[PDB]
Design a protein around this ligand. Structure first.
Ligand SMILES: Cc1cc2nc3c(=O)[nH]c(=O)nc-3n(C[C@H](O)[C@H](O)[C@H](O)COP(=O)(O)O)c2cc1C
Ligand SMILES: [C]O[C@]1([C]OC2=[C][C]=C([O])[C]=[C]2)=[C][C]=C([O])[C]=[C]1
Ligand SMILES: COc1ccc(O)cc1
Ligand SMILES: COc1ccc(O)cc1
Ligand SMILES: COc1ccc(O)cc1
Ligand SMILES: COc1ccc(O)cc1
Length: 348
């Protein structure tokens, strides 16, 4: 067998060409310093994965009330910008490329992290449970954002994108997936609004598109990607009506000629009734531009999928934690170590 196609050069667009089809998926590590500034250990961590065609950074918060987990880096202070610049300089020095993933957690934020302020979301719909690996941080009922809150959020996504330029990233992946703020507007469980941001596919898509457009206005379409989750099941109850939101959203996104759309799922072998099959096949059926697949792929199954025109680029997550040298090992058909959650305790 052979995975030669994973090492094809891939021209994303006129601004960026990737040296291979392999992305490092965004992976939250919770290892930033207490001021949410990237550490020199994080610099080394990313630098040693620069053989990836493109690194997507761990989710990076746009402002304080976006924080939902400990020590997740931000990109809203000068110190954070300076810390990220060390990361991107090191990646670039190693011949790599890197996008930051811009995050707001919405109803999954927790006030413990930002001085007891309001948790924000499309609607006052609380999720079950408490923050993982933390003592007694029970999720709270969010405040339904006002249109003025929304305008500020769009502004702050845009400002974060401006900061990304100063931090030396090649671009931004907007975190529109996995039950976080943008995804909360796209799903009925979390979005029960009756104004121009709720109800209809056009309205539910409005926030996502405003953020995409605001960020494009800062860094350009060639440097802007978006991660999406048409499905549910990560802090999100399913709803049979969610699919038509994405039916509308995807062609609208295609108008923006993004660097890529990226699916956010853990196992793309799962078929979802509401999507008529796998997440990637649903998106591929409704979106005709560069698509990043992900979720329990091996190099072999990803190569096959790309050969079969199922998607164009492969993001690799857990195996990139277990194998910093993932790309070289795949290139040389060497044995890969299996991932285990225990590995998260170490930043290597
Ligand atoms: C520890 C861990 C952290 C993750 N953090 C992020 C994240 O910050 N942003 C995101 O969009 N996805 C995140 N994911 C999802 C991964 O990007 C990826 O979609 C998932 O791990 C499936 O790919 P894989 O089977 O190759 O690991 C995380 C996954 C894991 C296991
Ligand atoms: C946050 O993270 C966590 C982190 O993770 C994630 C993120 C984001 C996304 O999208 C996905 C995932 C980790 C771990 C745990 O447990 C939880 C959460
Ligand atoms: C990746 O490590 C962590 C993830 C989530 C969290 O709440 C604490 C640690
Ligand atoms: C946009 O929100 C913030 C920006 C900068 C800062 O120091 C604190 C918050
Ligand atoms: C990340 O956005 C940008 C990065 C570099 C640049 O020259 C212009 C925009
Ligand atoms: C394997 O690591 C994880 C996978 C899934 C998840 O929800 C949390 C951690």
């Amino acid at each position: 067998n052979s995975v030669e196609n994973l090492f094809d050069t891939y021209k994303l667009n006129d601004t960026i060409t990737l040296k291979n089809r392999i992305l490092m998926a965004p992976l939250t590590r919770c290892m930033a310093d207490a001021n949410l500034v990237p550490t020199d250990d994080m610099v080394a961590y990313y630098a040693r994965r620069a053989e990836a065609g493109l690194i997507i950074s761990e989710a990076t918060i746009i402002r304080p009330d976006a924080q939902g987990y400990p020590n997740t880096p931000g990109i809203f202070t000068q110190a954070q910008i300076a810390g990220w610049r060390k990361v991107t300089d090191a990646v670039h020095a190693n011949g790599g490329k890197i996008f930051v993933q811009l995050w707001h957690t919405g109803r999954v934020a927790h006030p413990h992290f930002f001085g007891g302020g309001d948790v924000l979301a499309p609607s006052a719909q609380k999720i079950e449970g408490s923050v993982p690996r933390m003592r007694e941080l029970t999720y709270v009922t969010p405040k339904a954002v006002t249109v003025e809150d929304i305008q500020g959020l769009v502004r702050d996504y845009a400002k974060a994108a401006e900061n990304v330029i100063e931090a030396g990233f090649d671009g931004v992946e907007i975190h529109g997936a996995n039950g976080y703020l943008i995804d909360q507007f796209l799903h009925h469980d979390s979005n029960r609004r009756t104004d121009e941001y709720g109800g209809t596919p056009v309205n539910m898509s409005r926030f996502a598109l405003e953020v995409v457009d605001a960020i494009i206005a800062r860094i350009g379409h060639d440097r802007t990607g978006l991660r999406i989750s048409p499905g549910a099941y990560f802090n999100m109850a399913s709803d049979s009506r969610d699919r038509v939101v994405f039916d509308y959203l995807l062609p609208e996104l295609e108008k923006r000629d993004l660097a890529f759309v990226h699916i956010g799922i853990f196992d793309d072998s799962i078929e979802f009734d509401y999507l008529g099959g796998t997440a990637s096949s649903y998106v591929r059926a409704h979106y005709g531009k560069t698509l990043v697949g992900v979720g329990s792929y091996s190099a072999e199954t990803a190569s096959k999928a790309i050969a079969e025109d199922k998607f164009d680029l492969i993001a690799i997550g857990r195996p990139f934690i277990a194998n910093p040298d993932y790309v070289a090992k795949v290139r040389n058909s060497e044995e890969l170590v299996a991932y285990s959650d225990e590995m998260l305790a170490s930043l290597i």
